[PDB]
Amino acid sequence: PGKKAPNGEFAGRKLKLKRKKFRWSDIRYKRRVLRLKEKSDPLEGAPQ
Amino acid sequence: TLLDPLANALSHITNSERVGKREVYIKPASKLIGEVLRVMQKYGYIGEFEFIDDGRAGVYRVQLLGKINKAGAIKPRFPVKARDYERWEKRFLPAFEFGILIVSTSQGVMSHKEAREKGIGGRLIAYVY
Amino acid sequence: ARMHARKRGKSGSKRPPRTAPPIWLEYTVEDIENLVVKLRKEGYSTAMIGTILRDQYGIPTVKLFRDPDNPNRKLTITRILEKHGLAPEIPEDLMFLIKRAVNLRKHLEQHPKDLHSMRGLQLIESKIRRLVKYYKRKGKLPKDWRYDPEQ
Amino acid sequence: GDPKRQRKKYETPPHPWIKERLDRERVLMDKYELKNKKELWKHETQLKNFRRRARRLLAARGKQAEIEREQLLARLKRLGLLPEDAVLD
Amino acid sequence: RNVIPMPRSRFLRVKCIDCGNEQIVFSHPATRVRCNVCGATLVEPTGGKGIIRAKILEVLE
Amino acid sequence: LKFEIPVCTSCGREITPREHATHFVCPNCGEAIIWRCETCRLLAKPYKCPKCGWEGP
Amino acid sequence: SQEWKEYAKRVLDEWQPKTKLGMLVKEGQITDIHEIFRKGYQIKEPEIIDVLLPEVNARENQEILDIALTVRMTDSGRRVRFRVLAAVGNRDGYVGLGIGHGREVGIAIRKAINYAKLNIIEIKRGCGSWECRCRRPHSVPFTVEGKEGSVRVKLIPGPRGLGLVIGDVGKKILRLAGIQDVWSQTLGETRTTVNFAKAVFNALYNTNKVVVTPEMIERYGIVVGRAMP
Amino acid sequence: EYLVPLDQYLAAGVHIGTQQKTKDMKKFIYRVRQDGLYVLDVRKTDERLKVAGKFLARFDPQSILAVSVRLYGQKPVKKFGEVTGARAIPGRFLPGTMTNPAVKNFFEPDVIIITDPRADHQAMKEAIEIGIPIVALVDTENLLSYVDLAIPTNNKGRKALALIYWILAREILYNRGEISSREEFKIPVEEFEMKI
RNA sequence: CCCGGGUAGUCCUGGCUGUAAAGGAUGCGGGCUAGGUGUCGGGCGAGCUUCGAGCUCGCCCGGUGCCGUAGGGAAGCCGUUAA
RNA sequence: GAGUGGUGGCCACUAUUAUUGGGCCUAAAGCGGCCGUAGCCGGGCCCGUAAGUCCCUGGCGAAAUCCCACGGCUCAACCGUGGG
Ligand SMILES: [Mg+2]
Ligand SMILES: [Mg+2]
Ligand SMILES: [Mg+2]
Ligand SMILES: [Mg+2]
Ligand SMILES: [Mg+2]
Ligand SMILES: [Mg+2]
Ligand SMILES: [Mg+2]
Ligand SMILES: [Mg+2]
Ligand SMILES: [Mg+2]
Ligand SMILES: [Mg+2]
Ligand SMILES: [Mg+2]
Ligand SMILES: [Mg+2]
Ligand SMILES: [Mg+2]
Ligand SMILES: [Mg+2]
Ligand SMILES: [Mg+2]
Ligand SMILES: [Mg+2]
Ligand SMILES: [Mg+2]
Ligand SMILES: [Mg+2]
Ligand SMILES: [Mg+2]
Ligand SMILES: [Zn+2]
Ligand SMILES: [Zn+2]
Ligand SMILES: [Zn+2]
Ligand SMILES: [Zn+2]
């Protein structure tokens, strides 16, 4: 594996896309954004 | 392919000074490399240097003194305003006046201390300490 | 490295740095241009003409004389031929690659199962397309010119 | 967004049960006869604020910075914490 | 040092055995070098340095 | 007053507290003191006396 | 300080040196702690440091960093062994770190304290922080790095009165060397106490490896060894 | 001119190297013969011998140590120690002789002489750790790593080693003043070498 | 599993399928950072020779192996064919 | 300490989302291999331009909220006059 990419000055779009793409591999992020706990909680988000 | 002559020169210098070489040859020369060498010599980081002509781009011959902890190029070349030098110093240097950042301005290539004195900004291109 | 094979051969010419033509060279510019025109009319390629001039007449490259008409530039073989109207219509390396490709296309008609020689054809045509793109950009070829193998 | 909410004026320890810190604070509490820890913590916060202002102004330059520098020195030596010839250091 | 490249080939001033003509030729030819007057062979090409069949007079700088 | 830290004869860098350096009088003249740091000794770097000019290991 | 003078006098008379450096120190040809560094000597007798730096024996100048017990397996059961990690210093400019082993805890502690004296080093102190430019030796004079095992340590100069912003092992080691304020950053597994301690020790040793000019000594207030007011 | 006639140097075989070479020994190599064997320069050997004679004469006589693991070098170092008063260890070097104070023959010298850096690797390794100057005899095959004064010679032959140590002992004696002239030194070269 | 038999298949011609521990378990281009020693292709120099497109030694470029200094690494190990 | 505990949420811890600043031989991870379109990254010198970039100066980005000094409620929390 070579140097981390992209590093160019005018390559912001691809860099933002890369970070957005690999954030979905994070299980904490995916469950909050898709609201997976809310869909199956018998308490419906209540504390009691 | 070759993409950046200035990065090659600085990585070559920092590789050579770690094994105690006394001189180096910078193979693709350019005016920008000459300016960086002049600024480095003014502050005592290198000895004398000279230009040698082949039919190609030319070569630089440099004398080392064992006074460089580290030297490198900055990519990309970030713009910097005349009152923002402190954070780049904290990013690249080890103490509050230890070493120099080398800045390209519309009045020439100079160290960041001279540029801060004149009150102008520019582009960061290298660091040496 | 090599464009497709990624090998790293280094062999080539090692030209000394000189500005003025050597003292022992006695030809003037008129003689050299006469010689170049004569050799071209014998039918040699541009790369071959310089080889003959170096080998037999003792003339290291003609890129040692200033262009008599335009002082801004030095003299080259293609420029000398342009001054007389004998310069090639298509750039030579493109022509050589096209010639190599045509001969290989008739080999592959009688040998359809020669799959290793076919990859060579594909690489040759990739080189041709790179070259035609470069020449279109610089204006050495018309905008309509196209490489079609059936031509 | 949200309207303003009034915030506490003191800071609590990052770990509640550290032996050395407990010993030091007990010594201070007994000597000066304070009612509870938060009282002590209140004063600690004051000190830190002063320090945080001095660290910021040593590294600043311009016209407003000098005004704030002399204001800090004047406020400190009006309270009786510094001699009348003290410097920012 | 060897920072500047220097060629290992030389230009030679030779004398034809038959015609007596004097010429300047290259030491590493890629073609057959022949006399400019009579047409006899002077240097034969090889993989590297060429085989000289004429009398060598001088090695040019 | 303070004390001065010795400096390598070949490279000019200071000697660290626990490195395998060495020092000795000049073999040829015996009037100057040669210091060699660990890196110079490992790499067989030459040295040169400041008084007589005799050089090298 | 007065007690340690007569302690050093007492040790000096009843000591029979076995090495060359010991012979030099016994004869009085070497009189200060700084004269045994930077010339390639070997240090094999613990009495040298006792005579030259008597205050490393004070209870407040020694620290037991950790105690572990490790097992070797045999057909007749498990054989237990103790490992002790310890450090000493003079709280001014000198510090040492050592490991000792033994069949019981007391033997291991004694050997660990003994080896820490043989591994003594001297460091450089100063002030190099952007928001404190006071020229007094209360911190490191510039950013330094060290490593051991998987642990990487970076030490950063801090303002006066800040404290030691580092884990506890680093706190003790830096306190014994005479440093009051620092920031830090780490990578790796810091719960492995031996590697953490060694990494901090290496970072301190590397202050001698940075090239400096005479202007910088004046600017950062750099002091080598004893502060000496 | 020379410490001995060059005929003597060549007759002892001082100039005979081996099949291999190293980059750092090339300042001493003279030429290479047609069968792949390298030859040493004889004038460099003489000059370095004179310098080494001047250098060792300033040390206290009983603080010099000379070692030789090789069998052909054991007799010359023993005779050299007998003449000059230095300690000599021929044969196996016991590990810890210079690093373990509990060993019976513990001894810390001021300068060491190595007959062959490759064969005497234990002694060199221990000498690096106590920070003393190292003087060694080097062949075309050796490295100059951690050598402070090098004397280029054949360090494998019998007569060669005998002659080298004979000359060095005479130089030490003359420089430190125990004989008033080089000629007064009446001890034959044959007394220095191993017989049969 | 071992022994005696045995269909598809393995082979050729024209097509489809697109899979392997398809592993150097190591994506590709460029600059730089000690040495030592084998072997394959080309070139240069010197010495032999039964005159061979032959043999031995040395140097330059490009492939292909081993041991190893600085450095790297959790270690095994890698180390100008870099990890 | 007039408070002190339990449950659920967000930030920190976390360099477990990494521009600053992570990894991919053996631990998760280099497409079975290669050719090439957009995109990103691109050798040396001379002349021009002034789009990016840097400096100076006009018109704007409400009030409240944030930081500092001084003044009014016993001090403070709060509120006023000024500077940011
Ligand atoms: Mg709303
Ligand atoms: Mg058993
Ligand atoms: Mg390690
Ligand atoms: Mg069967
Ligand atoms: Mg396979
Ligand atoms: Mg060959
Ligand atoms: Mg190779
Ligand atoms: Mg290896
Ligand atoms: Mg957590
Ligand atoms: Mg990770
Ligand atoms: Mg693959
Ligand atoms: Mg794979
Ligand atoms: Mg491609
Ligand atoms: Mg460019
Ligand atoms: Mg503009
Ligand atoms: Mg507003
Ligand atoms: Mg009032
Ligand atoms: Mg008030
Ligand atoms: Mg208000
Ligand atoms: Zn003729
Ligand atoms: Zn050195
Ligand atoms: Zn001298
Ligand atoms: Zn300070």
mmCIF file of C-alpha atoms in Angstrom, chain C:
data_model
loop_
_atom_site.group_PDB
_atom_site.id
_atom_site.type_symbol
_atom_site.label_atom_id
_atom_site.label_comp_id
_atom_site.label_asym_id
_atom_site.label_seq_id
_atom_site.Cartn_x
_atom_site.Cartn_y
_atom_site.Cartn_z
ATOM 1 C CA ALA C 1 9.964 2.071 -16.712
ATOM 2 C CA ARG C 2 8.599 0.476 -19.867
ATOM 3 C CA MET C 3 5.047 1.464 -20.713
ATOM 4 C CA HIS C 4 3.591 -2.057 -20.662
ATOM 5 C CA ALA C 5 6.278 -4.501 -19.521
ATOM 6 C CA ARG C 6 7.474 -2.373 -16.542
ATOM 7 C CA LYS C 7 11.127 -3.279 -17.160
ATOM 8 C CA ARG C 8 13.857 -0.760 -16.414
ATOM 9 C CA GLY C 9 16.446 -0.760 -19.169
ATOM 10 C CA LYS C 10 18.781 2.217 -19.102
ATOM 11 C CA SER C 11 20.703 1.992 -22.381
ATOM 12 C CA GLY C 12 20.882 5.123 -24.497
ATOM 13 C CA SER C 13 23.128 7.873 -25.776
ATOM 14 C CA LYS C 14 25.398 9.926 -23.496
ATOM 15 C CA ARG C 15 25.857 13.276 -25.191
ATOM 16 C CA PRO C 16 28.612 15.579 -23.896
ATOM 17 C CA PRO C 17 27.619 19.187 -23.114
ATOM 18 C CA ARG C 18 28.937 21.372 -25.922
ATOM 19 C CA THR C 19 27.746 24.603 -27.525
ATOM 20 C CA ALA C 20 30.045 25.235 -30.497
ATOM 21 C CA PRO C 21 30.772 22.661 -33.185
ATOM 22 C CA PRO C 22 34.159 20.980 -32.789
ATOM 23 C CA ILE C 23 37.264 22.466 -34.354
ATOM 24 C CA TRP C 24 38.071 19.442 -36.519
ATOM 25 C CA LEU C 25 34.659 19.562 -38.233
ATOM 26 C CA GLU C 26 35.130 21.321 -41.569
ATOM 27 C CA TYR C 27 31.703 21.235 -43.232
ATOM 28 C CA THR C 28 29.678 24.437 -43.449
ATOM 29 C CA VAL C 29 25.893 24.679 -43.195
ATOM 30 C CA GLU C 30 25.404 24.623 -46.971
ATOM 31 C CA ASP C 31 27.247 21.322 -47.352
ATOM 32 C CA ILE C 32 25.250 19.681 -44.564
ATOM 33 C CA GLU C 33 21.888 20.743 -45.983
ATOM 34 C CA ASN C 34 22.921 19.501 -49.415
ATOM 35 C CA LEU C 35 23.875 16.157 -47.876
ATOM 36 C CA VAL C 36 20.604 15.878 -45.963
ATOM 37 C CA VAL C 37 18.533 16.586 -49.073
ATOM 38 C CA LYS C 38 20.513 14.057 -51.111
ATOM 39 C CA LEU C 39 20.133 11.326 -48.490
ATOM 40 C CA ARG C 40 16.415 12.037 -48.151
ATOM 41 C CA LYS C 41 15.973 11.748 -51.906
ATOM 42 C CA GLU C 42 17.676 8.376 -51.663
ATOM 43 C CA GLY C 43 14.660 7.438 -49.536
ATOM 44 C CA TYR C 44 15.992 7.055 -45.985
ATOM 45 C CA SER C 45 14.008 7.858 -42.864
ATOM 46 C CA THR C 46 14.794 10.831 -40.645
ATOM 47 C CA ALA C 47 16.346 8.707 -37.903
ATOM 48 C CA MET C 48 18.457 6.867 -40.473
ATOM 49 C CA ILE C 49 19.831 10.042 -42.073
ATOM 50 C CA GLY C 50 21.399 11.200 -38.820
ATOM 51 C CA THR C 51 22.900 7.765 -38.258
ATOM 52 C CA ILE C 52 24.556 7.872 -41.680
ATOM 53 C CA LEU C 53 25.802 11.425 -41.123
ATOM 54 C CA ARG C 54 27.365 10.409 -37.815
ATOM 55 C CA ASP C 55 28.880 7.152 -39.057
ATOM 56 C CA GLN C 56 30.305 8.086 -42.443
ATOM 57 C CA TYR C 57 30.823 11.858 -42.570
ATOM 58 C CA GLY C 58 31.891 12.450 -38.971
ATOM 59 C CA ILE C 59 29.106 14.899 -38.185
ATOM 60 C CA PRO C 60 27.752 14.749 -34.643
ATOM 61 C CA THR C 61 24.167 15.941 -34.641
ATOM 62 C CA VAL C 62 23.106 18.864 -36.834
ATOM 63 C CA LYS C 63 21.736 20.360 -33.618
ATOM 64 C CA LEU C 64 25.031 22.211 -33.268
ATOM 65 C CA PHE C 65 24.428 24.900 -35.901
ATOM 66 C CA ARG C 66 22.153 27.896 -35.451
ATOM 67 C CA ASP C 67 19.319 28.162 -37.986
ATOM 68 C CA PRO C 68 20.614 30.673 -40.568
ATOM 69 C CA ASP C 69 17.176 32.202 -41.094
ATOM 70 C CA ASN C 70 15.695 32.119 -37.593
ATOM 71 C CA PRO C 71 18.398 32.922 -35.005
ATOM 72 C CA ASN C 72 16.098 31.952 -32.119
ATOM 73 C CA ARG C 73 16.394 28.213 -32.760
ATOM 74 C CA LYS C 74 18.914 25.554 -33.700
ATOM 75 C CA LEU C 75 18.815 23.312 -36.753
ATOM 76 C CA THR C 76 17.184 19.879 -36.964
ATOM 77 C CA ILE C 77 16.710 17.364 -39.755
ATOM 78 C CA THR C 78 12.953 17.811 -39.999
ATOM 79 C CA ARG C 79 13.412 21.589 -40.148
ATOM 80 C CA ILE C 80 15.926 21.233 -42.980
ATOM 81 C CA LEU C 81 13.501 19.040 -44.893
ATOM 82 C CA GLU C 82 10.660 21.498 -44.246
ATOM 83 C CA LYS C 83 12.738 24.273 -45.805
ATOM 84 C CA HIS C 84 12.626 22.324 -49.101
ATOM 85 C CA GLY C 85 9.222 20.610 -49.001
ATOM 86 C CA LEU C 86 10.428 17.025 -48.462
ATOM 87 C CA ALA C 87 9.093 16.672 -44.932
ATOM 88 C CA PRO C 88 6.739 13.752 -44.203
ATOM 89 C CA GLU C 89 2.997 14.325 -44.284
ATOM 90 C CA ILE C 90 2.319 12.025 -41.318
ATOM 91 C CA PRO C 91 4.723 12.001 -38.343
ATOM 92 C CA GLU C 92 7.164 9.156 -38.770
ATOM 93 C CA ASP C 93 6.663 7.177 -35.558
ATOM 94 C CA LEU C 94 2.899 7.080 -36.096
ATOM 95 C CA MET C 95 3.501 5.853 -39.647
ATOM 96 C CA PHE C 96 5.873 3.122 -38.458
ATOM 97 C CA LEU C 97 3.396 1.896 -35.860
ATOM 98 C CA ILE C 98 0.587 1.872 -38.424
ATOM 99 C CA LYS C 99 2.769 -0.118 -40.806
ATOM 100 C CA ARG C 100 3.597 -2.636 -38.077
ATOM 101 C CA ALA C 101 -0.091 -3.053 -37.226
ATOM 102 C CA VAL C 102 -1.262 -3.699 -40.798
ATOM 103 C CA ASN C 103 1.227 -6.527 -41.307
ATOM 104 C CA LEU C 104 0.150 -8.154 -38.049
ATOM 105 C CA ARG C 105 -3.528 -8.023 -39.018
ATOM 106 C CA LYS C 106 -2.951 -10.261 -42.013
ATOM 107 C CA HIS C 107 -1.010 -12.750 -39.895
ATOM 108 C CA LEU C 108 -3.999 -13.074 -37.581
ATOM 109 C CA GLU C 109 -6.310 -13.950 -40.470
ATOM 110 C CA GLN C 110 -4.520 -17.242 -41.160
ATOM 111 C CA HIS C 111 -3.794 -17.909 -37.462
ATOM 112 C CA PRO C 112 -6.970 -17.152 -35.500
ATOM 113 C CA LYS C 113 -5.809 -19.191 -32.476
ATOM 114 C CA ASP C 114 -2.571 -17.229 -31.980
ATOM 115 C CA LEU C 115 -3.794 -15.434 -28.884
ATOM 116 C CA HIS C 116 -0.390 -14.269 -27.656
ATOM 117 C CA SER C 117 0.357 -12.340 -30.846
ATOM 118 C CA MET C 118 -3.055 -10.685 -30.545
ATOM 119 C CA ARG C 119 -2.200 -8.966 -27.269
ATOM 120 C CA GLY C 120 0.733 -7.401 -29.083
ATOM 121 C CA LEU C 121 -1.716 -6.033 -31.635
ATOM 122 C CA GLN C 122 -3.820 -4.517 -28.855
ATOM 123 C CA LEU C 123 -0.792 -2.841 -27.278
ATOM 124 C CA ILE C 124 0.319 -1.449 -30.647
ATOM 125 C CA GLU C 125 -3.109 0.053 -31.236
ATOM 126 C CA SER C 126 -3.110 1.611 -27.763
ATOM 127 C CA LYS C 127 0.166 3.336 -28.639
ATOM 128 C CA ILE C 128 -1.348 4.532 -31.922
ATOM 129 C CA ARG C 129 -4.333 6.083 -30.169
ATOM 130 C CA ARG C 130 -2.151 7.887 -27.615
ATOM 131 C CA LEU C 131 -0.102 9.339 -30.466
ATOM 132 C CA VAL C 132 -3.080 10.469 -32.522
ATOM 133 C CA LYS C 133 -4.545 12.235 -29.492
ATOM 134 C CA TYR C 134 -1.281 14.108 -28.956
ATOM 135 C CA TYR C 135 -1.002 15.113 -32.610
ATOM 136 C CA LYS C 136 -4.618 16.255 -32.857
ATOM 137 C CA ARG C 137 -4.098 18.501 -29.844
ATOM 138 C CA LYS C 138 -1.038 20.174 -31.397
ATOM 139 C CA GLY C 139 -2.537 20.578 -34.876
ATOM 140 C CA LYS C 140 -0.212 18.243 -36.791
ATOM 141 C CA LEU C 141 -3.265 16.242 -37.953
ATOM 142 C CA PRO C 142 -6.690 17.324 -39.219
ATOM 143 C CA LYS C 143 -9.684 17.233 -36.897
ATOM 144 C CA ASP C 144 -11.390 14.525 -38.982
ATOM 145 C CA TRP C 145 -8.437 12.131 -39.288
ATOM 146 C CA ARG C 146 -9.223 8.729 -37.799
ATOM 147 C CA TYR C 147 -7.519 5.374 -37.431
ATOM 148 C CA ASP C 148 -9.757 2.694 -38.904
ATOM 149 C CA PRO C 149 -8.016 -0.650 -39.504
ATOM 150 C CA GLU C 150 -10.249 -1.581 -42.459
ATOM 151 C CA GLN C 151 -8.901 1.432 -44.363
#
